[PDB]
């Protein structure tokens, strides 16, 4: 079985490279962040522009939804994160304390904490209600490319250009595990699987890898795309068939069968690197977004 993703909508309006797109957990919305210092909200099903959220002083590398779809957090070159009330557009809090660009961010499943990673080589844990930094982890020896909470928030996974993925205990801040394979390329992305058993890690040697982090074993590798320079998001697609979805530096979206590791689809149409992809939580919908020479977001839909 193979999906049949087809282009449905192209979303224009960011004035520089897009950096990340994320569907709201309730499926209603797509949020996008850009080097143009803006967040934009779009209808998830029709791509209709909803609103622009502004206030960062420099470009934004990442944005993420709270689990109730009410809040966003963004990570900016202005070395802050910002917590936004999406409905009002208000900036509820500005999270300050990284000493270099903030690159990646996520809420925990409760959405009472935020985790961030930065060019300052640190991972930080922040209280959502007060905006105060609770912990600073001396996590890596190079910029932190991704941070993600596991299913119950007990764990944080981080990835870094230093070649490592690390698993941290949220409560204590202890480093519980370091994961690295036989080669040491920079790690450009990591996230836990939906069931929390696995981590999916991207490295800048054109490779995605599915790990059992408890056993510290690499279970699957996904290849065929181009990824040597950019921190490209990757996703688990679970609404229809079980796929792996990723952008690529050859301007395509790649879709692999999770179990067999075969490429099952490539989506063509962006005019620059596909920096980011997201999978809708209930419908077979992929959002993709591209860099400076393209500046657009595309929505693709499939029957499986």
């Amino acid at each position: 079985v193979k999906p049949n993703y087809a282009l449905k909508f192209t979303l224009a309006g960011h004035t520089k490279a897009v950096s990340s797109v994320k569907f709201s957990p309730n499926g209603e919305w797509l949020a996008s962040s850009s080097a143009d210092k803006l967040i934009k909200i779009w209808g998830a099903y029709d791509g209709k522009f909803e609103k622009t959220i502004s206030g960062h002083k420099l470009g934004i590398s990442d944005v993420a939804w709270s689990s109730d779809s009410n809040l966003l957090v963004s990570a900016s070159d202005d070395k802050t994160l910002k917590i936004w009330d999406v409905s009002s557009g208000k900036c509820l809090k500005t999270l300050k304390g990284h000493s270099n660009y903030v690159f990646c961010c996520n809420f925990n499943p409760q959405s009472n904490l935020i985790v961030s990673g930065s060019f300052d080589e640190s991972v930080r844990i922040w209280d959502v209600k007060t905006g105060k930094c609770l912990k600073t982890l001396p996590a890596h020896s190079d910029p932190v490319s991704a941070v993600h909470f596991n299913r119950d928030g007990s764990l944080i996974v981080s990835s870094s250009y230093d070649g490592l993925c690390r698993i941290w205990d949220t409560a204590s801040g202890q480093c519980l595990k370091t994961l690295i394979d036989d080669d040491n390329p920079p790690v450009s992305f990591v996230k836990f699987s939906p069931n929390g058993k696995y981590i999916l890690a991207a490295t800048l040697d054109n490779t995605l890898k599915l790990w059992d982090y408890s056993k510290g074993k690499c279970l699957k590798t996904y290849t065929g795309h181009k990824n040597e320079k950019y921190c490209i998001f990757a996703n688990f697609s679970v609404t229809g068939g079980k796929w792996i979805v990723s952008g690529s530096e050859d301007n395509l979206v790649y879709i692999w069968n999770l179990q067999t590791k075969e490429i099952v689809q490539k989506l063509q149409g962006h005019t620059d690197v596909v920096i980011s992809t997201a999978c809708h939580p209930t419908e077979n919908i992929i959002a993709s977004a591209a860099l400076e020479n393209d500046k657009t977001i595309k929505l693709w839909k499939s029957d499986c």
């Binding site: 520089k16 962040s33 470009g59 590398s61 400076e292």
Partner: peptide, 9 residues
């Protein structure tokens, strides 16, 4: 700009 959009050089 934004660091993600620049890549690692």
């Amino acid at each position: 700009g934004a660091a993600r959009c620049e890549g690692f050089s």
